[PDB]
Write a protein that binds this ligand. Structure first.
Ligand SMILES: *Cc1c(COP(=O)(O)O)cnc(C)c1O
Ligand SMILES: *Cc1c(COP(=O)(O)O)cnc(C)c1O
Ligand SMILES: [Cl-]
Ligand SMILES: [Cl-]
Ligand SMILES: [Mg+2]
Ligand SMILES: [Mg+2]
Ligand SMILES: [Mg+2]
Lengths: 386, 386
C-alpha cells in the first residue's frame, strides 16, 4: 500500500489510456497517425509516463507547449518526434536542433533568421518545422494564401530548416452548430490546394483535435492531435452525448484521512471565517489537500469527496493545504481511511466533469492545474508504479 | 536580458521581502522571533530563495506543509528549524528525525507510536515535536485541557521525542469582528496556564499569523508565523485598511508578445467558442500564458494585462497555454514587447489583490497556484538571478 508523509496522491491508469487510444484509432481512418498531446505535464497526468505509454499503443508523435516540455521528454529517453505548438523564441533555435525538437512557425522573417542562426553554426541537422495556418482560432498562424506561399518559399529556401508538417486548429468543433468548423475546414483545404497548384508537395497534414476526430473523422488527413480524449475525457458534453467513442477517465485523486473528531466542545467553528458550525455530535474529518494543490477554493462549502462509497461535503473553507469534510453527526470514520476526491469509489463517483460544472469551467482546467507537489502513481496491467 | 524559449516568467523581488520582514519585526515585540511560512513552494514564489533570504534578514525558523517540503530546504543547505504544520504519517518519522525536521502532533497514540518506531530503528537523532492546540479553527489539534495534559505527558515520557513548541491558529483574526479571536486567545492562554499549574515548563509558544501579528501584536508570545505578509500581501482588505504596517508586493508575472496581427481578413473570431469578434483594423497580440500556468480561465474576456503602461483586455477565451489581448484599432505593439500580467508597469498596476477580487477568491490562492513550469527569477540589491 502507498507510503507517503503527506497522504494525497494521483493515480493515472495507463490501461485506460491504452483503451482510449485504441478507441480513437478504431474510429478514425486506418491511414491516419495519432499525435499524442502531452503539453502542460500531460494535462496534469505526468507527461513522461503518458507519452511513453501512448507511443507504445498507437501514437507515433507528441505535442507539447514549449521547447522546455519537449526537453523533459527527451531526458526521459523518448526519441519520437515532438512538436512545439506555441511560439518559440529565436534564442532557442540552436537548442531545439540539438534536441531534435520540431518547432511551429509561420512568418517569413522567423524562418530566415532561424536559418541564419543555424548557418552560422556547425549544424549537422536541419531543424524540423511545422507551419501553422490560422483559419479562425485567431491565436497563432498565417491567415492568407499569399502570405502562406511566401512562408513556404522561405522555409524551402532555408537549407538548414526542414518542412515536416502543416496544420490548423478548430475553435468550435465541440459545439452543436458546425457552421464555423465547416468553414475552417473549407478554408484550410483551399489554402492547401492553392499550394499544390503552385507545384508544392505537402508534408504531414493535421487539423483535428479530439472533438473533430470524433465528430469529423473524415478530416483526420495524415494525422490527428489527440489531447483530452487520451486522458479519457470528452471535449464537451455535446461530443460525449454523440455516443460515437467510448472513453475511460484515466485520473483519480485520492487522500487519506489525517484526523477524525467529534465536535463535542465549543467553539464548533470550522476553518477560516468560521463559515461553518458543527453540531455537538457531528464528526469532522481533515484531509491533506487544499487550494495550493489545485483543489479550488471555490469548492469551500460546495465540494464533495467519497468516503466508504458515499458523498460527504466540504465543511467550511478550503485552506491552502487542507480541507475538512463532515461525516455527519457520527459519520463513521477513522484516521487513515481512503477517500476519493476525483474519481470512483464503490458505486459512487465524483468525476472531473462534475467538478468543472460546479466551478463553471471545463475538465481541461481541472486536471491541468493539479500541482506538481502531488505525487503521481501509474497503473499498468492492473499493477501500480512510479 | 532574460532568454527563454517560452517567454513567460515570474520575478520575485527579495528587496521587498526584506522590507516586509523588517516592517513586521519593527511592529511586533522585540523579544518575539519570526517563523517564515514557506509552504506550497513559498506561496508559489519559490521556497528555497525566499527562506534563505528571510533567515538572513530577521526570521529564525521556517514552516512548511509537509516533510517533503522541509527536505527540499535541507538539501538547499538550510540548517534552521523547520516545522511541518499539517499531519505527518508515522511512516515518515524515521526520515523526519534523520533530516532534523520538526513535526506537529497532538495525539497520545501518535506520540507513543512515533517513539516506538524510532526506538526500534535505533534512531541516531531525536524527533522535535510541536503540539497543536485547536482553539476554534477545527482543522487539527487537541481540543480539551485534560486531553492536552495527556498528550504532553506522553511526549515527555518519549525519550526519542523532544518538545520544542506549542501553538494554535486563529480562524478569523483578519476580520473586523474580533470576538472569536479574543475567545481563541483566552482559551489558548487558559490551556497553557493549566499546564503550568501542573508544574510543566512551556516550550516556545506561538499563535499569530500575519493578521494577528498586525492587529494583535501583544499576542506575539515567543514567536509568530509570518506567511502572506512576507510576500508583501495583506491577509484581508480590513487588515490592510488598518494602516499599521507597510508591505510591498514581492511577486510580478510577466511575458513577451509572441505574435501581433491586424484582423484584416475573415473570419475575425478569436479563441475557443468564437466568443470574441475583432474589427477589421483591430490589432490582436498573443501571449504565452494560459490556465495550466494558473492564469484562471474565468479571466476569459475579462482580465487585463499591462502593455506600454496601459491596461489591455483579454480577448476571447483563455486557452491552456496562451491568451489573446486587444491592442485596439491600429494599436501599437510588436512581437517581443514586455507585458505585465500581475504587477506594475510604468504608471500602471494590476495587483494580485485586484485579480483575486475579479475571481472572487484571495491573494493567497492567486500566487500559490502559479505553476512550477513558469521559471522564477529573483531580484536582490536591484539585480536579477535564478
Ligand atoms: C491543446 C491542443 C490540442 C489538443 O486538443 P484536445 O482538444 O485536448 O484534444 C490540439 N491542437 C492544438 C493546437 C492544441 O493547443
Ligand atoms: C499558512 C499558515 C500560516 C501563515 O499564515 P498567513 O495568513 O499567511 O500569515 C500561519 N499558521 C498556520 C497554522 C498556517 O497554516
Ligand atoms: Cl493556434
Ligand atoms: Cl490547524
Ligand atoms: Mg505546480
Ligand atoms: Mg511602529
Ligand atoms: Mg485556480
Amino acid at each position: 500500500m502507498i507510503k507517503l508523509c503527506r497522504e494525497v496522491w494521483i493515480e493515472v491508469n495507463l490501461d485506460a489510456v491504452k483503451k482510449n487510444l485504441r478507441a480513437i484509432r478504431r474510429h478514425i481512418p486506418h491511414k491516419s497517425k495519432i499525435m499524442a498531446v502531452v503539453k502542460a505535464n500531460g494535462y496534469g497526468h505526468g507527461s513522461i509516463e503518458v507519452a511513453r505509454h501512448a507511443l507504445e499503443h498507437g501514437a507515433s508523435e507528441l505535442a507539447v507547449a514549449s521547447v522546455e516540455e519537449g526537453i523533459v521528454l527527451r531526458k526521459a529517453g523518448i526519441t519520437a518526434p515532438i512538436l512545439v505548438l506555441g511560439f518559440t523564441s529565436l534564442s532557442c533555435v540552436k537548442k531545439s536542433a540539438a534536441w531534435n525538437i520540431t518547432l511551429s512557425a509561420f512568418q517569413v522573417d522567423w524562418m530566415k533568421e532561424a536559418n541564419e542562426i543555424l548557418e552560422k553554426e556547425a549544424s549537422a541537422n536541419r531543424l524540423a518545422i511545422h507551419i501553422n495556418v490560422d483559419t479562425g482560432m485567431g491565436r497563432l498562424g498565417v491567415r492568407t494564401k499569399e502570405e502562406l506561399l511566401e512562408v513556404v518559399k522561405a522555409l524551402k529556401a532555408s537549407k538548414f530548416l526542414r518542412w515536416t508538417g502543416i496544420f490548423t486548429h478548430f475553435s468550435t468543433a465541440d459545439e452543436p452548430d458546425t457552421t464555423l468548423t465547416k468553414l475552417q475546414h473549407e478554408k484550410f483545404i483551399s489554402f492547401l490546394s492553392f499550394l499544390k497548384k503552385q507545384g508544392i508537395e505537402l508534408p504531414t497534414v493535421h487539423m483535428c483535435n479530439t472533438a473533430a476526430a470524433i465528430a469529423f473523422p473524415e478530416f483526420s488527413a495524415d494525422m490527428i492531435r489527440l489531447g483530452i480524449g487520451l486522458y479519457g475525457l470528452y471535449p464537451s458534453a455535446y461530443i460525449k452525448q454523440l455516443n460515437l467513442v467510448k472513453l475511460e477517465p484515466a485520473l483519480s485523486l485520492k487522500a487519506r484521512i489525517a484526523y477524525v473528531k467529534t465536535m463535542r466542545t465549543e467553539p464548533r467553528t470550522v476553518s477560516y471565517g468560521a463559515t461553518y458550525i458543527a453540531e455537538p455530535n457531528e464528526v469532522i474529518a481533515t484531509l491533506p489537500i487544499g487550494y495550493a494543490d489545485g483543489y479550488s477554493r471555490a469548492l469551500s462549502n460546495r465540494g464533495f469527496v467519497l468516503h466508504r462509497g458515499k458523498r460527504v461535503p466540504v465543511a467550511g473553507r478550503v485552506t491552502m493545504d487542507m480541507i475538512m469534510v463532515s461525516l455527519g453527526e457520527n459519520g463513521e470514520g477513522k484516521q487513515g481511511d481512503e477517500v476519493v476526491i476525483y474519481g470512483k469509489q464503490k458505486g459512487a463517483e465524483i468525476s472531473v466533469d462534475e467538478v468543472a460544472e460546479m466551478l463553471n469551467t471545463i475538465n481541461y482546467e481541472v486536471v491541468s492545474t493539479l500541482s506538481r507537489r502531488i505525487p503521481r502513481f501509474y497503473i499498468r496491467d492492473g499493477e501500480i508504479f512510479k
